[PDB]
């Protein structure tokens, strides 16, 4: 039962961003000398082998719209998750210089939807859709990241009222821990569309415990301000309190906002340029 040491298997390089449940680093697989991303989760207070088994299952996923998993390695109380590295920045990173235009939003949402359609067709739930987990390559390709595990890391805490993580993107049925399915991602997608349009999810000025309380009780958010009627309607379609009333990802790919505004992903290199200029 002697475990491989991830610090020997991988060279941890610079931090590249805050992930859910842990910081994310660029890394090198020392066996292949290939670049990877590494997220280290501290599981001192927690079923570890169930999470590793599911990461192994998810490492078999294969889609242009979803980052690869490359397994995970436990070291004492820390779980090293190994992932495909993308270097363009997350959509959250790329929101820093200023507002996105509706073509950028529609392009990014279209790619997210294709990734959600893939995961849902494989009977998986992303469960952590937010701009921070939407990644760009240096060429503008868009892939979902950190999918398929957040439920194992949070659902029990939510049941016990011991969850202290961030609630802004959670569907009401996830907060109430009733039966939830892929439609939970569709709610989170609607919140993420607001985040891409306005820079932050609804209720971002409120205490997270008030937000956890509000989401299942309040009318769902809507997109307010100078935004096109199709974009507002796309948001409204996602943000229905009843999950059976939300459309599937496959249906949303046909939404007129997506079809009339999405353009080539290669144009999103302009967004990466803006980040460079912002930080130059
Ligand atoms: O699979 C990942 N999950 C981790 C998802 C949460 C972190 C997202 N923030 C991020 N992420 C990058 C990155 C690279 C270069 C510059 C900025 C970057 N900002 N790269 C990355 C992330 C992952 N892979 N590659």
Q: Single out the catalytic residue among 93, 117, 128, 185.
A: 128
- Give the Å distance between the CA of 206 and the centre of ligand 1: 27
- Contact predicate 23/35, CB 8 Å: no
For residue 168 and ligand 1, the question of a CB distance below 6 A is answered with no
Region for 228 from its dihedrals, namely left if φ exceeds 0, alpha if ψ lies in -120 to 50, beta otherwise: beta
Alpha-carbon distances of 20 from 11, 201, 206, rounded to whole Å: 21, 16, 20
Q: How far apart are CA 254 and CA 207, in angstroms?
A: 36
Structural contact between residues 211 and 272, judged by C-beta atoms closer than 8 angstroms:
no
Q: Got the DSSP string for 191-210?
A: HHHHHHHHSS-TTTTS-HHH
DSSP 85: -
CA neighbours closer than 13 Å in the CB half-sphere of residue 169: 22
Q: Which of 37, 254, 258 is nearest to 137 (CA)?
A: 37
List 41's β-bridge partners, or say none: 79
Atom 2 in ligand 1: which residue has the minimum CA distance?
145
Residue with tokens 């302009």: 270
**DSSP-derived 3-state class of residue 83:** strand
CB of 37 within 6 A of ligand 1: the answer is yes
Task: Please enumerate, as own/partner, the contacts of 267-271 that have beta carbons within 8 Å and a separation of 24 or more.
Answer: 267/103, 267/104, 267/107, 267/140, 268/88, 268/104, 268/107, 268/108, 268/136, 268/140, 268/142, 269/138, 269/139, 269/140, 271/94, 271/100, 271/104, 271/136, 271/140
Q: Strand, coil or helix: what is 161?
A: coil
Q: Report the distance separating Cα 270 and Cα 218, nearest Å.
A: 38
The angle formed by the CA atoms of residues 245, 249 and 252, to the nearest 5 degrees, is: 80
Integer distance in angstroms from the first to the last C-alpha of the chain?
49
Place of tokens 């889609």: 63
CA distance 82 to 54: 13
DSSP state of 66: B
* Listed residue (273, 100, 75) closest to 198, CA to CA: 100
Is the CB of 133 within 6 Å of ligand 1? yes
Structural determination approach = X-ray
Domain ranges of the chain: 1-85, 86-278
Active site residue 128: yes
Tokens representing residue 117 in the block: 């359609």
10, 16, 129, best to mutate for ligand 1 pocket (most atoms within 8 Å of CB): 16
Distance from the CA of 261 to the center of ligand 1, in angstroms?
A: 26
3-state secondary structure of 131: helix
CA distance 247 to 54: 27
How many angstroms does the Cα of residue 229 sit away from the middle of ligand 1? 32
Give the integer Cα–Cα distance in Å for 191 and 31: 40
Tokens 């859709």 map to which residue?
129
């Amino acid at each position: 039962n002697l475990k491989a040491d991830p610090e020997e298997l991988f060279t941890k390089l610079e931090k590249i961003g805050k992930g859910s449940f842990g910081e994310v680093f660029k890394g090198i697989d020392n066996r292949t000398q290939k670049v990877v991303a590494i997220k280290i989760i501290d599981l001192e207070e927690a079923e570890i082998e169930d999470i590793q088994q599911e990461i192994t299952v998810l490492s078999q996923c294969d889609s242009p719209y979803v980052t690869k998993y490359y397994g995970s390695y436990l070291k004492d109380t820390k779980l090293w998750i190994i992932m495909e590295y993308l270097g363009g920045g997350s959509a959250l990173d790329l929101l820093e210089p200023g507002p996105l235009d509706e073509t950028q939003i529609a392009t990014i949402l279209r790619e997210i939807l294709k990734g959600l359609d893939y995961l849902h067709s494989e009977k998986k739930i992303h469960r952590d859709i937010k701009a921070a987990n939407v990644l760009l390559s240096e060429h503008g390709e868009v892939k979902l990241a950190d999918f398929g595990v957040a439920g194992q890391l949070t659902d029990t805490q939510i049941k016990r009222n011991t969850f202290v993580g961030t609630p802004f993107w959670m569907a009401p049925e996830v907060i109430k821990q009733s039966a939830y399915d892929s439609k939970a991602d569709i709610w989170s997608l609607g919140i993420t569309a607001i985040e891409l349009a306005r820079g932050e999810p609804p209720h971002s000025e409120l205490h997270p415990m008030k937000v956890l309380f509000l989401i299942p009780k309040n009318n769902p958010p809507t997109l307010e301000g100078n935004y096109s009627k199709p974009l507002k309607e796309f948001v409204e379609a996602c943000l229905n309190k009843e999950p059976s009333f939300r459309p599937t990802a496959k249906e949303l790919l046909k939404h007129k906002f997506i079809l009339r505004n999405a353009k080539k992903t290669s144009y999103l290199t302009e967004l990466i340029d803006a980040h460079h200029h912002h930080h130059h």
